Amino acid sequence: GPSFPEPKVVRSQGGLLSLKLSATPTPLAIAGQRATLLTYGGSFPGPTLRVRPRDTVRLTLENRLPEPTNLHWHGLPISPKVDDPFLEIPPGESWTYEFTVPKELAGTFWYHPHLHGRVAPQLFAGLLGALVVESSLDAIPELREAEEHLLVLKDLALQGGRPAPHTPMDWMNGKEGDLVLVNGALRPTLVAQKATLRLRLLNASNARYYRLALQDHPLYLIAADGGFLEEPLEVSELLLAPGERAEVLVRLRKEGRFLLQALPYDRGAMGMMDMGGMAHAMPQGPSRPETLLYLIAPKNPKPLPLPKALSPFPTLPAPVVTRRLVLTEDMMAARFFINGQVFDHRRVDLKGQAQTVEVWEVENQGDMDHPFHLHVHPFQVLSVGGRPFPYRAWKDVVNLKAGEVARLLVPLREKGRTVFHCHIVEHEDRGMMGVLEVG
Template structure:
């Protein structure tokens, strides 16, 4: 679907706009708020290459959409961006000012599991030092959020998240250095009064979605570009919402995925980001005007509630809306609740400068290693399963047990994992510490090489990934990044041992 103003009007006319949301949130429909850039986390850089910083989790009173709200944050929504450089050694002091236990996950960074410990527990009032070295070649966009099992969904949904940006030599090439850079943290909310709406049984089955979509905690901001080329670092920080992104009358040029740069820009008409995924894109503004960044409808196969009980939506996009009758009615009811196929949403309006002069695209970015698949030490199979009505989720028939090691691997080896989705809904598979490359999806090779830490699996998908276990030993995890599913069992323990 090519996104144009005419198609946008058609979809809005079909009842897929945001009128219900706008009726309850002042200023939502006007789109007059300026685009806000998240604040930077203050750093103390020493001559030795050491960087010191502090971060704290606490309850915060903020305003979203003109209404006062109470969230859990790292000092703002989103939390302050931690901007680092390749090769730096970082000492990050984290303090828990919440009334509940939490911890901190450095999502996507290739650092030791002893530092980025997903099983650590930091009690109220306690602190922990996170000390690590930013790997060479890791320039890219990462993020931080809690990872305390059983409470990830509630803490993340309530606002505990922030970006990590790593700069490297590639950022200095003229086509990137001279581009106008912005960070986009995509996050949805559902409120009851001024607080996050309580989790329902349906939330634990599907993953919690809200009808209030924000970019850097602002509803439909307007970004007034000063240059003809924009570089956008985009994070899907939602618990369960998928973002199928397109910009009116403009392609997106993908330059980086979860684990950093691709080899050269990849032209896309749309970009799908599953929960936890990041992407960096270039936008070349070739004419003056206003252009909307849209989240197109996407059906992830979620269970929906309707008057007669529950039903499962399929993966046919808007198909449930097109046949009229009872099916259409039930689909609409499901969408009104934020479940089933999502509706078209405007996330952001970009206003181009007069007579924009975009930069040429980079001809090359980084070299992405070609892994030697003749040296695979092990091939493993992982089946994702569920008992939906019990809100229980499995990997290879087992729910998460922190006292059980599910996979033992050896440092210095290369493994291939075959991921199979046996459920009726999408699941984004996330692996801590060790970046991987996607080899194929349903037997189809990927069109370009890229380092990833999260890959989406649709119903019945078979995805093969290659993982080099480098540098670190220790215990970490892999899981679904619909974090309600992680909390409800779809997670396993990986232990990497010395050679």
């Protein structure tokens, strides 16, 4: 019947997903418009890779961009010798990422550029795609009959048939676009056929937040960035910061057409006033509400019961180290710091021990939200703003509002050199990143 736009899915076959992906300028039609974006595999979003734990992924990235790039397997707890953020793939050159999917992993992940200084333009232009890890838990009766869909939330601005260029204000704020798209389409309609939906949600935007709400419906959170919750958590709305993912169940209990919306949200984005001879940041205030899609329930909907439980969160050793990481900004210079320093790929900032557990206290001493991301080592958010976190699940991005402290339980897994940074990728490019070495 009706065809909701969703990225094409490449599945592993016989334990192997082998794929060649070109990063290339791509003439496209989207939102009733012609524009040339940067894409992987010629699609915006890029293709969804779908794997199982212990599959081998062999992705050869061919750089057909006029500038160097690389890949980050966002959220995958794999060796930084594979997920190497320091690697530069020159134009015309290629690189083959090979890794084995970790053994008990489940959920929605994604891939995107990670060459320092070029992440924000390259991501904004369209370079992103999803990776879905199937789980034995998906076979339980309360999940195996749900209708599954991926929603890639990513906004865009267009100027002269190209992605709009980054202005000095964009480097300060992180760039939001006026086209608020789902899976590259403007306000699509999803016509459900089963009464229980599993929606895999990905915020692949540079800086835009999505305060998600479905008319007349709660959402049952069942997974965070990097794995299942212990049990479904009913919520009335769900904030997704840049880089975060979530999976929710929607129980359609009556016929109709329902709007999925991004409600107003104030992330601390700023205008600028130049008066006298002095410049001053000025709060932009909350976002305008946005319709993301229209959801239409099937005939006579009979949703099944929720799963009573999902996946028990592992027991972890007591931490041996607590670290303080302070985020700050020089807004008018569009410079961003951790512990008073900007990123220097030459400089190692934290050195920890593999197979130990640390507590990281991340403190936002700036004026904007900063969503803090760590590679390689998924963490358990213990508290934010002094309030205990409402569920247990692996996460790899945590949003910090101005003034907030997050306490994170960080088990150090794979050895090697990796990074942590703000996932407003303009801030990352402008210095809000540090280096962690695990030995």
